[PDB]
Amino acid sequence: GQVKGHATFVKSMTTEMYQEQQNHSLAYNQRLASQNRIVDPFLAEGYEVNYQVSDDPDAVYGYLSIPSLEIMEPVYLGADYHHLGMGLAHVDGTPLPLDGTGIRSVIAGHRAEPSHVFFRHLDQLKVGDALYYDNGQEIVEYQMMDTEIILPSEWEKLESVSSKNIMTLITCDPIPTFNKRLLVNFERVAVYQKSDPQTAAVARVAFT
Secondary structure: OOOHHHHHHHHOOOHHHHHHHHHHHHHHHOOOOOOOOOOOOOOOOOOOOOOOOOOOOOOOOOEEHHHHHOOOEEEOOOOHHHHHHHHHOOOOOOOEEEEEEEEEEEEEEEOOOOOOOOOHHHHOOEEEEEEEEEOOOEEEEEEEEEEEOOOOHHHHHHHHOOOEEEEEEEEEEOOOOOOEEEEEEEEEEEEEEOOOHHHHHHHHOOOO
C-alpha cells in the first residue's frame, strides 16, 4: 500500500534517470546562493516554484522512512497544499538532500491532516532514532540529533547553522493551535548503494 508506491518509484528509476536527477539536484542546490526568503510551508500553497529537477512538477522525488514511527512516505518537491495533501514535501529555498558540508535540507509534513498520520508524531523521536531516505539507487541513513520550536515568520532559522549535513523535519505545533513550527534535525550517517549486498538489510528494515 505504502510499499507499492515505493516499489514503483524504485523500479522505474534507471541509472540514466538517477544520474539526471543527481545532476539537476546539484544545479538546483547551486542556484540557492542567488535566492533568499524560505517561505513558511504551512501558509498555504506556495508562491511559484520551478525546481527544474523533473519534467513533471508532481513526480515523487524520493522516499522517506522513519521506522520507529512507522512512517514511510513519498517526498514531493515544493510544499503547497496539493503536495502536502499527498505526502511529505521538500521546502523550496533549502537544498535538496545531497552529500556535502553545510547542507540543511528541509522536508515538511502535516500534523493532523484529515486522512493521514504524516508527521503527527515527530515529537516522540529520541536522539539516535534512524531515518532512511531513498533516492532510487541509494539509501541515505540519518540519525536524530535535536529539536527546536520556532515561529513561522522565523524563516532564517531554517537555514544551515553548521558545516554538518542535515535533514530537518518541520511540522505544525502544538495541536490544535498550530501557531508554531516543530523542527526535528537529523545528521547524515552513511549512504548505501543498492548494488551492495549489505544494502538489502537496510532496505528490508526501512521499506517494509
